[PDB]
Amino acid sequence: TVARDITLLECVGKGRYGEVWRGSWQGENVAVKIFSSRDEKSWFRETELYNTVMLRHENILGFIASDMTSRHSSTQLWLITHYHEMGSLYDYLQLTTLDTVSCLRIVLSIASGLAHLHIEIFGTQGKPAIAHRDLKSKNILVKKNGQCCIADLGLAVMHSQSTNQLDVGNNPRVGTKRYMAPEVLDETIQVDCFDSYKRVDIWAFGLVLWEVARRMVSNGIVEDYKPPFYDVVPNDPSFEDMRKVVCVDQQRPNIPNRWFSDPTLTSLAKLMKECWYQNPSARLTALRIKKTLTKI
Ligand SMILES: COc1cc(-c2cncc(-c3ccc(CN4CCCC4)cc3)c2C)cc(OC)c1OC
């Protein structure tokens, strides 16, 4: 097993989900995710998706290996992937501002990744439709070429037209509350319809677009990095803080006036508002977003 050969060097992420370490393996950095004992269904789901489906795409965090090892006198579940030293989009947006080309590169490569997940590919070399269910800026990494890749398939849902079998797994984990779509927060989401989960992804992608656009300079200014709904919920908002803001008060992120004086940001403002329709079926698709961003 690889697990015992990897040298863990420093912790680069920690939460209720577990930890991620920068590790050394075969003379290279690798990312090692060590799952909390409470989150093993996530490791199960990610391993399934990376080893059984062979998910591989330039805008999807690149799988290396999945492993069971016992360190420190207990058995841990490890996921090992490429390590992106630029870190998460969430951190990246805090340490730098963006020009037009860099902003569009970022958001388009996210669209590319999410389209690839959402769309079914038939044949000997293919994949079922996949919905992410926890898309956020901390689950997006920034590559050295300035594109991004989507990470954390632990909540993935799958569907194939071959079988008409919706596969939601058995994970008790739920999405990051700050990013939950209205229909999740008010528990009217249609849980047996695969499209529902794609539309939850599109809502969260809209929020990520907002986070990114704020950091694009126009007429010499930018907004500070903030997370969606920073102004109306505390850190680590409860399910009820979000339900009140998003469902009862029907809040959406505010568009800064200066965006309408720049054409790219105007275009992006139009997109993100069409990810935020309360009616889930009215929201844009990943492929549509991808197509529009390509033209901008
Ligand atoms: C193994 O599994 C996963 C690894 C990663 C992952 C991959 N590459 C790099 C990183 C990272 C490296 C360094 C920093 C620190 N910053 C500060 C300033 C610059 C760098 C942040 C993040 C991480 C977390 C992410 C996952 O999900 C979110 C994983 O779970 C699927």
- Give the residue, out of 11, 59, 84, with the most ligand 1 atoms within 8 A of its beta carbon, to mutate for a pocket test: 84
Resolution (A): 2.1
Report the alpha-carbon distance of residue 162 to residue 265 in Å, rounded. 40
Q: Which of 194, 189, 190 minimizes the C-alpha distance to 164?
A: 194
What's the distance, Cα to Cα, between the start and end of the chain in Å? 47
Half-sphere exposure of 84 (CA within 13 A, CB side): 26
Report the alpha-carbon distance of residue 213 to residue 16 in Å, rounded. 29
Asked whether the CA dihedral 173, 176, 181, 184 is positive or negative, the reply is: positive
Residues in contact with ligand 1 by the CB-under-6-Å rule are 12-13, 20, 31-33, 61, 79, 81, 83-84, 87-88, 91, 139, 141, 151-152
CA-nearest residue, atom 17 of ligand 1: 87
Task: Please enumerate in sequence order all residues whose Cβ is within 8 A of that of 160, keeping only pairs 6 or more positions apart, or say none.
Answer: 120, 128, 129
CA of 17 to the centre of ligand 1 (A): 13
Report the alpha-carbon distance of residue 216 to residue 213 in Å, rounded. 5
Q: Which of 281, 253, 93 minimizes the C-alpha distance to 178?
A: 253
Where in the sequence numbering do the catalytic residues fall? 134
Experimental approach was: X-ray
Which region, left, alpha or beta, applies to residue 97 given φ > 0 means left and ψ of -120 to 50 means alpha? Answer: beta
Helix (H), strand (E) at residue 12: strand 7-15
Task: Please enumerate in sequence order all residues whose Cβ is within 8 A of that of 229, keeping only pairs 6 or more positions apart, or say none.
Answer: 178, 237, 242, 245, 246, 251, 253
Helix (H), strand (E) at residue 104: helix 100-118
Half-sphere exposure of 87 (CA within 13 A, CB side): 11
